[PDB]
Tab-separated table of N, CA, C and O in Angstrom:
chain	number	residue	atom	x	y	z
M	811	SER	N	97.978	152.762	107.826
M	811	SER	CA	97.171	151.935	107.574
M	811	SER	C	97.417	151.568	106.055
M	811	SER	O	98.153	150.805	105.539
M	812	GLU	N	96.690	152.659	105.486
M	812	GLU	CA	96.367	152.371	103.950
M	812	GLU	C	96.279	151.056	103.344
M	812	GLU	O	96.111	151.161	101.857
M	813	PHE	N	95.677	150.324	104.144
M	813	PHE	CA	95.129	148.937	103.647
M	813	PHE	C	94.095	148.905	102.885
M	813	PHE	O	94.013	148.286	101.915
M	814	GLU	N	93.234	149.953	102.689
M	814	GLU	CA	92.509	150.056	101.971
M	814	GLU	C	92.417	150.683	100.596
M	814	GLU	O	92.081	150.250	99.480
M	815	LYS	N	93.727	151.568	100.373
M	815	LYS	CA	93.848	152.199	99.684
M	815	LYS	C	94.748	150.784	98.832
M	815	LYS	O	94.872	151.030	97.462
M	816	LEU	N	95.518	150.156	99.304
M	816	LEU	CA	96.406	149.198	98.725
M	816	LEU	C	95.285	148.230	97.823
M	816	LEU	O	95.364	147.729	96.829
M	817	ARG	N	93.735	148.070	98.731
M	817	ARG	CA	93.134	147.484	98.139
M	817	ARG	C	92.397	147.387	96.888
M	817	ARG	O	91.988	147.290	95.859
M	818	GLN	N	91.872	149.407	97.152
M	818	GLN	CA	91.750	149.965	96.010
M	818	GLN	C	92.183	149.968	94.466
M	818	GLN	O	92.085	149.679	93.532
M	819	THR	N	93.652	149.832	94.885
M	819	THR	CA	94.712	150.168	93.882
M	819	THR	C	95.017	148.717	93.214
M	819	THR	O	95.625	148.749	92.216
M	820	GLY	N	94.908	147.685	94.205
M	820	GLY	CA	94.779	146.455	93.942
M	820	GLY	C	94.213	145.804	92.956
M	820	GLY	O	94.219	144.964	91.966
M	821	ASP	N	92.901	145.774	93.435
M	821	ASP	CA	91.622	146.013	92.570
M	821	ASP	C	91.459	146.122	91.351
M	821	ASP	O	91.651	145.451	90.435
M	822	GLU	N	92.240	147.304	90.740
M	822	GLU	CA	92.271	148.122	89.441
M	822	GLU	C	93.209	147.292	89.148
M	822	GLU	O	93.084	147.179	87.893
M	823	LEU	N	94.356	147.365	89.550
M	823	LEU	CA	95.641	146.363	89.078
M	823	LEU	C	95.084	144.972	88.283
M	823	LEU	O	95.318	144.690	87.612
M	824	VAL	N	94.614	144.546	89.494
M	824	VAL	CA	94.265	143.113	88.657
M	824	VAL	C	92.903	143.298	87.707
M	824	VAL	O	93.147	142.474	86.948
M	825	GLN	N	92.168	143.986	88.055
M	825	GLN	CA	91.175	144.326	86.900
M	825	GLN	C	91.779	144.687	85.448
M	825	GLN	O	91.593	144.192	84.504
M	826	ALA	N	93.257	145.415	85.434
M	826	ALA	CA	93.814	145.481	84.288
M	826	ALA	C	94.737	144.222	84.022
M	826	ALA	O	94.503	143.924	82.587
M	827	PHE	N	94.868	143.484	84.810
M	827	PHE	CA	95.605	142.429	84.675
M	827	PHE	C	94.494	141.221	83.569
M	827	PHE	O	95.170	140.527	82.901
M	828	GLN	N	93.367	141.550	84.240
M	828	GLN	CA	92.404	140.558	83.872
M	828	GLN	C	92.120	140.843	82.234
M	828	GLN	O	91.545	140.215	81.627
M	829	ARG	N	91.997	142.666	82.060
M	829	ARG	CA	92.405	143.135	81.027
M	829	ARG	C	93.014	142.648	79.786
M	829	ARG	O	92.955	142.366	78.750
M	830	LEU	N	94.435	142.478	80.583
M	830	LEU	CA	95.535	141.964	79.985
M	830	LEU	C	95.552	140.793	79.367
M	830	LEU	O	95.686	140.186	77.816
M	831	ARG	N	94.713	139.553	80.176
M	831	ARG	CA	94.322	138.275	79.719
M	831	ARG	C	93.925	138.489	78.292
M	831	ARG	O	94.342	137.441	77.436
M	832	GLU	N	92.754	139.114	78.166
M	832	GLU	CA	91.751	139.053	77.241
M	832	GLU	C	92.357	139.194	76.071
M	832	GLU	O	92.766	138.656	74.908
M	833	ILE	N	93.376	140.409	75.750
M	833	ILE	CA	94.134	140.770	74.798
M	833	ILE	C	95.233	139.879	74.758
M	833	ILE	O	95.714	139.828	73.320
M	834	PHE	N	95.730	139.236	75.629
M	834	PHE	CA	97.125	137.911	75.329
M	834	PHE	C	96.000	137.236	74.239
M	834	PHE	O	96.431	136.586	73.443
M	835	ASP	N	94.668	136.580	74.867
M	835	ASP	CA	94.313	135.860	74.156
M	835	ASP	C	93.823	136.054	72.669
M	835	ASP	O	93.757	135.432	71.911
M	836	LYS	N	93.505	137.167	72.370
M	836	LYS	CA	93.273	138.113	71.191
M	836	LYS	C	94.716	138.265	70.247
M	836	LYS	O	94.580	138.851	69.328
M	837	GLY	N	95.357	137.947	71.353
M	837	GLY	CA	97.300	137.916	70.231
M	837	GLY	C	97.107	139.358	69.672
M	837	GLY	O	97.552	140.171	68.988
M	838	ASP	N	96.720	140.738	70.333
M	838	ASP	CA	96.501	142.208	70.042
M	838	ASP	C	97.328	142.782	70.440
M	838	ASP	O	97.174	143.310	71.401
M	839	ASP	N	98.714	142.995	70.055
M	839	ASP	CA	99.804	143.296	70.555
M	839	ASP	C	99.637	144.838	70.477
M	839	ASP	O	100.433	145.473	71.392
M	840	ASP	N	98.665	145.468	69.646
M	840	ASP	CA	98.333	146.916	69.669
M	840	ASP	C	98.028	147.691	70.918
M	840	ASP	O	98.388	148.208	71.707
M	841	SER	N	97.061	146.438	71.434
M	841	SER	CA	96.456	147.165	72.869
M	841	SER	C	96.868	146.920	74.144
M	841	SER	O	96.893	147.286	74.881
M	842	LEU	N	97.671	145.049	73.646
M	842	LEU	CA	98.573	144.923	74.569
M	842	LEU	C	99.639	146.084	75.322
M	842	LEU	O	99.829	146.050	76.285
M	843	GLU	N	100.106	146.870	74.055
M	843	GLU	CA	101.400	147.643	74.688
M	843	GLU	C	100.582	148.775	75.583
M	843	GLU	O	100.792	149.348	76.740
M	844	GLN	N	99.702	149.349	75.245
M	844	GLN	CA	98.573	150.441	75.904
M	844	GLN	C	98.339	149.971	77.458
M	844	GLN	O	98.756	150.565	78.282
M	845	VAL	N	98.054	148.967	77.058
M	845	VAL	CA	97.590	148.014	78.773
M	845	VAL	C	98.457	147.506	79.515
M	845	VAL	O	98.931	148.062	80.844
M	846	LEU	N	99.664	147.238	78.801
M	846	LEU	CA	101.016	147.057	79.770
M	846	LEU	C	101.553	148.071	80.401
M	846	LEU	O	102.118	148.405	81.386
M	847	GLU	N	101.509	149.476	79.906
M	847	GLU	CA	101.660	150.931	80.808
M	847	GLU	C	100.673	151.181	81.415
M	847	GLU	O	101.051	151.697	82.366
M	848	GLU	N	99.515	151.225	81.466
M	848	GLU	CA	98.474	151.303	81.951
M	848	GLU	C	98.547	150.411	83.490
M	848	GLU	O	98.428	150.857	84.457
M	849	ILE	N	99.291	149.128	83.573
M	849	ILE	CA	99.476	148.193	84.381
M	849	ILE	C	100.686	148.754	85.083
M	849	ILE	O	100.293	148.833	86.675
M	850	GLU	N	101.565	149.153	84.646
M	850	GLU	CA	102.678	149.384	85.019
M	850	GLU	C	102.719	150.853	85.865
M	850	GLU	O	103.292	150.966	86.958
M	851	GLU	N	101.566	151.460	85.192
M	851	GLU	CA	101.573	152.706	86.336
M	851	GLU	C	100.751	152.405	87.551
M	851	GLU	O	100.945	153.023	88.710
M	852	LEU	N	99.711	151.594	87.617
M	852	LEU	CA	99.086	150.878	88.776
M	852	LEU	C	100.056	150.668	89.443
M	852	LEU	O	99.946	150.202	90.722
M	853	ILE	N	101.035	149.633	88.979
M	853	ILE	CA	101.622	148.776	89.978
M	853	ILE	C	102.453	150.223	90.635
M	853	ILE	O	102.608	149.549	91.985
M	854	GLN	N	102.745	151.259	90.070
M	854	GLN	CA	103.772	152.116	90.661
M	854	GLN	C	102.678	152.447	91.867
M	854	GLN	O	103.134	153.033	92.799
M	855	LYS	N	101.503	153.087	91.459
M	855	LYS	CA	100.897	153.630	92.123
M	855	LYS	C	100.124	152.649	93.192
M	855	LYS	O	100.001	153.622	94.970
M	856	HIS	N	100.095	151.436	93.431
M	856	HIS	CA	99.910	150.625	94.579
M	856	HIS	C	101.134	150.335	94.986
M	856	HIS	O	101.439	150.680	96.180
M	857	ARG	N	102.711	150.318	94.563
M	857	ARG	CA	103.301	150.026	95.273
M	857	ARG	C	103.970	151.308	96.081
M	857	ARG	O	104.410	151.410	97.332
M	858	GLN	N	103.959	152.316	95.265
M	858	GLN	CA	104.293	153.489	96.030
M	858	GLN	C	103.358	153.637	97.469
M	858	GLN	O	104.404	154.535	98.315
M	859	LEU	N	102.574	153.236	97.255
M	859	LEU	CA	101.773	153.354	98.799
M	859	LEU	C	102.595	152.798	100.367
M	859	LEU	O	102.730	152.633	101.657
M	860	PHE	N	103.119	151.546	99.311
M	860	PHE	CA	103.677	150.614	100.811
M	860	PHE	C	105.067	151.146	100.553
M	860	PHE	O	105.991	150.735	101.826
M	861	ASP	N	105.742	151.539	99.862
M	861	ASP	CA	107.171	152.403	100.125
M	861	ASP	C	106.912	153.785	100.991
M	861	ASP	O	107.438	154.132	101.444
M	862	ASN	N	106.030	154.596	100.739
M	862	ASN	CA	105.675	155.178	101.830
M	862	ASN	C	105.171	154.619	102.653
M	862	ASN	O	106.252	154.911	104.093
M	863	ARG	N	104.547	154.144	103.221
M	863	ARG	CA	104.045	153.452	104.566
M	863	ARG	C	104.133	151.794	104.561
M	863	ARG	O	103.407	151.223	104.202
M	864	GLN	N	105.468	151.268	105.077
M	864	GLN	CA	105.858	149.956	105.008
M	864	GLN	C	105.382	149.402	105.773
M	864	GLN	O	106.168	149.079	107.211
M	865	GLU	N	104.099	149.223	106.098
M	865	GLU	CA	103.353	148.486	107.228
M	865	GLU	C	103.233	147.050	106.804
M	865	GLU	O	103.462	146.104	107.679
M	866	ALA	N	102.509	146.673	105.662
M	866	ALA	CA	101.945	145.516	105.356
M	866	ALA	C	100.992	144.802	105.661
M	866	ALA	O	100.730	144.848	107.516
M	867	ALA	N	100.159	143.475	105.669
M	867	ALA	CA	99.369	142.673	106.485
M	867	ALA	C	100.474	141.592	106.833
M	867	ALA	O	99.544	140.675	107.558
M	868	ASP	N	101.726	141.023	106.318
M	868	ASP	CA	102.247	140.259	106.308
M	868	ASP	C	103.853	140.189	105.821
M	868	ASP	O	103.546	140.908	104.566
M	869	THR	N	104.674	140.119	105.849
M	869	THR	CA	105.913	139.916	105.024
M	869	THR	C	105.855	139.001	104.159
M	869	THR	O	106.478	139.332	103.105
M	870	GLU	N	105.300	137.765	104.349
M	870	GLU	CA	105.097	137.260	102.908
M	870	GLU	C	104.422	137.996	101.520
M	870	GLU	O	105.061	137.622	100.533
M	871	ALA	N	103.122	138.511	101.622
M	871	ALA	CA	102.473	138.936	101.111
M	871	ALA	C	103.571	140.267	100.128
M	871	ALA	O	103.717	140.392	98.995
M	872	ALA	N	104.287	140.770	101.222
M	872	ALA	CA	105.303	141.913	100.345
M	872	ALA	C	106.228	141.250	99.543
M	872	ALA	O	106.506	141.849	98.550
M	873	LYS	N	106.882	140.307	99.736
M	873	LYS	CA	107.934	139.114	99.368
M	873	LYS	C	107.115	138.728	98.023
M	873	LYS	O	108.103	139.062	96.908
M	874	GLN	N	106.130	138.242	97.975
M	874	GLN	CA	105.418	138.054	96.660
M	874	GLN	C	104.825	138.821	95.848
M	874	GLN	O	104.729	138.986	94.848
M	875	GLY	N	104.906	140.031	96.734
M	875	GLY	CA	104.259	141.387	95.537
M	875	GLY	C	105.452	141.982	94.664
M	875	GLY	O	105.256	142.102	93.930
M	876	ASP	N	106.500	141.986	95.718
M	876	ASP	CA	107.670	142.365	95.129
M	876	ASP	C	108.338	141.357	93.651
M	876	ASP	O	108.709	141.501	92.639
M	877	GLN	N	108.002	139.970	94.251
M	877	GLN	CA	107.960	138.810	92.925
M	877	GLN	C	107.080	139.032	91.859
M	877	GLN	O	107.973	138.680	90.682
M	878	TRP	N	106.265	139.220	92.488
M	878	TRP	CA	104.915	139.641	90.968
M	878	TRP	C	105.729	140.347	90.315
M	878	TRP	O	105.641	140.670	88.919
M	879	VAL	N	106.066	141.620	90.806
M	879	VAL	CA	106.589	143.031	89.540
M	879	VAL	C	107.930	142.557	89.141
M	879	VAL	O	107.747	142.695	87.990
M	880	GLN	N	108.377	141.792	89.439
M	880	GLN	CA	109.549	140.879	88.439
M	880	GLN	C	109.115	140.400	87.604
M	880	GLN	O	109.641	140.296	86.577
M	881	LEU	N	108.231	139.098	87.864
M	881	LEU	CA	107.270	138.396	86.810
M	881	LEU	C	107.171	139.337	85.759
M	881	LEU	O	107.349	138.450	84.339
M	882	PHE	N	106.469	140.633	86.034
M	882	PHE	CA	105.833	141.040	85.224
M	882	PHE	C	106.578	141.907	84.145
M	882	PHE	O	106.746	142.111	83.160
M	883	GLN	N	107.917	142.380	84.959
M	883	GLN	CA	109.018	142.198	84.356
M	883	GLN	C	109.645	141.670	83.107
M	883	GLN	O	109.868	141.935	82.124
M	884	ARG	N	109.633	140.131	83.271
M	884	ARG	CA	110.117	139.076	82.752
M	884	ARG	C	109.363	138.768	81.644
M	884	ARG	O	109.627	138.477	80.759
M	885	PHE	N	107.770	139.111	82.170
M	885	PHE	CA	106.829	138.915	81.269
M	885	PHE	C	106.957	139.925	80.224
M	885	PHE	O	106.972	139.298	78.823
M	886	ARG	N	107.212	140.934	80.457
M	886	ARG	CA	107.496	141.776	79.377
M	886	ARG	C	108.629	142.055	78.298
M	886	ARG	O	108.828	142.011	77.087
M	887	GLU	N	109.627	141.206	79.295
M	887	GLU	CA	111.230	141.499	78.728
M	887	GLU	C	110.750	139.943	77.317
M	887	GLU	O	111.411	139.713	76.435
M	888	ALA	N	110.052	139.196	77.928
M	888	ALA	CA	109.671	137.913	77.109
M	888	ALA	C	108.975	138.650	75.811
M	888	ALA	O	109.030	138.088	74.315
M	889	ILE	N	108.025	139.360	75.619
M	889	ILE	CA	107.103	140.193	74.645
M	889	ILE	C	108.455	140.889	73.648
M	889	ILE	O	108.166	140.983	72.244
M	890	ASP	N	109.164	141.357	74.900
M	890	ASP	CA	110.273	142.360	73.718
M	890	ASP	C	111.151	141.390	72.742
M	890	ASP	O	111.300	141.784	71.958
M	891	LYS	N	111.363	140.447	73.334
M	891	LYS	CA	112.322	139.415	72.809
M	891	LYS	C	111.659	138.773	71.971
M	891	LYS	O	111.987	137.582	71.065
M	892	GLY	N	110.448	138.659	71.870
M	892	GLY	CA	109.332	137.767	71.011
M	892	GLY	C	109.433	136.346	71.397
M	892	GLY	O	109.178	135.435	70.729
M	893	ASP	N	109.788	136.056	72.413
M	893	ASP	CA	109.518	134.513	73.201
M	893	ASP	C	108.065	134.378	74.129
M	893	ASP	O	107.670	134.547	74.758
M	894	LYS	N	107.563	133.767	72.360
M	894	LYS	CA	106.149	133.132	72.751
M	894	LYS	C	105.703	132.417	74.024
M	894	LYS	O	105.008	132.402	74.509
M	895	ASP	N	106.923	131.278	74.024
M	895	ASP	CA	107.208	130.327	75.033
M	895	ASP	C	107.238	130.735	76.618
M	895	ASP	O	106.272	130.156	76.940
M	896	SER	N	107.945	131.772	76.875
M	896	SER	CA	107.791	132.467	78.276
M	896	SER	C	106.736	133.065	78.471
M	896	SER	O	106.329	132.939	79.599
M	897	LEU	N	105.864	133.341	77.747
M	897	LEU	CA	104.440	134.176	77.689
M	897	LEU	C	103.989	133.687	78.596
M	897	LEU	O	103.413	133.847	79.538
M	898	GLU	N	103.580	132.138	78.024
M	898	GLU	CA	102.574	131.496	78.226
M	898	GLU	C	102.826	131.043	80.033
M	898	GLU	O	102.125	131.053	80.843
M	899	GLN	N	104.071	130.177	80.102
M	899	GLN	CA	104.778	130.227	81.446
M	899	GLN	C	104.680	131.088	82.476
M	899	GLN	O	103.876	131.256	83.902
M	900	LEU	N	105.117	132.443	82.159
M	900	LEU	CA	105.105	133.495	82.892
M	900	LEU	C	103.742	133.957	83.119
M	900	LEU	O	103.779	134.252	84.514
M	901	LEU	N	102.693	133.807	82.817
M	901	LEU	CA	101.309	134.279	82.631
M	901	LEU	C	100.508	133.387	83.901
M	901	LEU	O	99.995	133.709	84.560
M	902	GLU	N	101.074	131.704	83.480
M	902	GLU	CA	100.573	131.235	84.633
M	902	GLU	C	101.183	131.403	85.917
M	902	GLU	O	100.468	131.665	86.936
M	903	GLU	N	102.655	132.071	86.223
M	903	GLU	CA	103.111	131.710	87.279
M	903	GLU	C	103.102	133.099	87.535
M	903	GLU	O	102.506	133.252	88.992
M	904	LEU	N	102.264	134.416	86.734
M	904	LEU	CA	101.666	135.391	87.609
M	904	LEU	C	100.431	135.274	88.106
M	904	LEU	O	100.094	136.120	88.878
M	905	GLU	N	99.368	134.724	86.986
M	905	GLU	CA	98.160	134.658	87.712
M	905	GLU	C	98.337	133.679	89.056
M	905	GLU	O	97.347	133.988	89.818
M	906	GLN	N	98.889	132.720	89.266
M	906	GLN	CA	99.034	132.141	90.702
M	906	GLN	C	99.323	132.773	91.826
M	906	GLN	O	99.022	132.989	92.716
M	907	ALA	N	100.506	133.631	91.424
M	907	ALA	CA	100.998	134.771	92.506
M	907	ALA	C	100.056	135.954	92.740
M	907	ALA	O	99.904	135.891	93.906
M	908	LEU	N	99.348	136.385	91.757
M	908	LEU	CA	98.278	137.327	91.948
M	908	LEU	C	97.234	136.670	92.812
M	908	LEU	O	96.824	137.554	93.791
M	909	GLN	N	97.054	135.452	92.282
M	909	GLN	CA	95.479	135.064	93.640
M	909	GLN	C	96.086	134.731	94.685
M	909	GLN	O	95.551	134.895	95.780
M	910	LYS	N	97.062	134.124	94.931
M	910	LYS	CA	97.856	133.724	96.379
M	910	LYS	C	97.785	135.614	97.195
M	910	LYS	O	97.668	135.221	98.090
M	911	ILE	N	98.085	136.501	96.485
M	911	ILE	CA	98.631	137.622	97.330
M	911	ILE	C	97.148	138.325	97.528
M	911	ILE	O	96.915	138.911	99.071
M	912	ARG	N	96.268	138.226	96.589
M	912	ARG	CA	94.937	138.646	97.174
M	912	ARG	C	94.043	138.166	97.889
M	912	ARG	O	93.715	138.346	99.153
M	913	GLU	N	94.507	136.213	98.109
M	913	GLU	CA	94.252	135.796	99.491
M	913	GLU	C	94.515	136.059	100.864
M	913	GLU	O	93.676	136.259	101.297
M	914	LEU	N	95.636	136.419	100.643
M	914	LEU	CA	96.701	136.840	101.951
M	914	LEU	C	96.189	137.803	102.275
M	914	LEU	O	95.777	138.451	103.437
M	915	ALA	N	96.130	138.969	101.368
M	915	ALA	CA	95.629	140.254	101.695
M	915	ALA	C	94.777	140.872	102.206
M	915	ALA	O	94.491	141.877	102.919
M	916	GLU	N	93.369	139.764	101.678
M	916	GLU	CA	92.048	139.992	102.665
M	916	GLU	C	91.867	139.504	103.979
M	916	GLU	O	90.924	139.865	104.726
M	917	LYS	N	93.017	139.002	104.242
M	917	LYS	CA	93.034	138.087	106.000
M	917	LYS	C	94.441	138.613	106.058
M	917	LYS	O	95.360	139.195	105.622
M	918	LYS	N	95.309	137.878	107.478
M	918	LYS	CA	95.989	137.829	107.665
M	918	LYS	C	96.645	136.423	107.970
M	918	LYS	O	96.119	135.826	108.714
M	919	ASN	N	97.727	136.274	107.024
M	919	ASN	CA	98.020	134.459	107.100
M	919	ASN	C	99.150	134.288	107.990
M	919	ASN	O	100.206	135.465	107.972
């Protein structure tokens, strides 16, 4: 099953993501790096559950889930490259994807 675990680890990941937004709006790169690491650890923690037991609530959710991870990677790449423009764009795509995954995960689409 692990659907409960995915939820408990997803909530915390999302919560960290929400925290990431505040720091982003505050332009505090110092706090941002620390949280980015925290988020990455949570991603691994949540993803590892799916890697262990590949059940999922649906295939689309898994596809968007992995896609979100890739977007997160690009988001960081833009931070490392100092690309402020892409950060805003990727952030919007990250939020939309995250909101969609949660919606799907709470039910079966």
